From a paper:
MAT (methionine adenosyltransferase, also known as S-adenosylmethionine synthetase; EC 2.5.1.6) is the only known enzyme that synthesizes SAM (S-adenosylmethionine), the principle methyl group donor and precursor for polyamine and glutathione synthesis. The function of MAT2A is further dependent upon an interaction with the auxiliary subunit MAT2B, encoded by the MAT2B gene. MAT2B is present only in mammals and bears no sequence homology with the catalytic MAT1A/2A subunits, but instead harbours signature motifs of the SDR (short-chain dehydrogenase/reductase) superfamily. MAT2B was proposed to modulate the catalytic activity of MAT2A by lowering its Km value for its substrate Met and the Ki value for its product SAM.
Residue numbers in the entry: 28 to 59, 78 to 94, 114 to 324
The structure:
Amino acid sequence: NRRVLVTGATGLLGRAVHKEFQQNNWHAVGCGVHHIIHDFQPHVIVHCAVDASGNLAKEAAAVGAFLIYISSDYVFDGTNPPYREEDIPAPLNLYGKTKLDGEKAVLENNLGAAVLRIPILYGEVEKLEESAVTVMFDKVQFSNKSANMDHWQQRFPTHVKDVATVCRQLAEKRMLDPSIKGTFHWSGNEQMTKYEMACAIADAFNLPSSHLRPITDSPVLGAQRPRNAQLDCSKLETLGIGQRTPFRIGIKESLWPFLI
Ligand SMILES: [Cl-]
């Protein structure tokens, strides 16, 4: 009788996490929440999102639940990759600052909580817009118009199923190890720009890619972005935790229903 509560269970990552636990002998309940936490008494809470997060950390502490707060590589300035969990964060934008404030809010209100920083995600989306990787597909698929692709920012596309497996593995290790707490990193091992991802998508579905224009210049509009906020995963790898899907396989599985 192992119980897990997955917040944001309707989202891309939430659905993968909920299903990973459920298919591996866990009684999984998903939220699309203080009453649910008392009635279910979950052993583990996987939070997919600051005042609410900090309040959820208190609720988790009160029932003795292992809380996993999902965070981002955007907490780092991406000037000196790779980034260890012991490295000092320096968020360049509001997204990174909110995630870092979220982490602090959780770790300050729950001493046994874990933070899992992950990079750009993709998976079996219901809508192309659900992922910043999958939203590109129609620009790749249709060659009638030239399409500018970022070839400046270094990313590590990670399958939500990899993040889901790591969440379950971290939760299962914690069950027999109370030292499992603090900050953790998980990421795919393939360094790719949006242009390199578009190229990999084109090749996976045997599509023409000559209409794709790589933009190698630094951004000139919008919020400041980390060039290479690569996460090092030695911490989890030493613990025997991890799963990594090759992008060319993971993106084929994910985008197959949207091929026109
Ligand atoms: Cl923006």
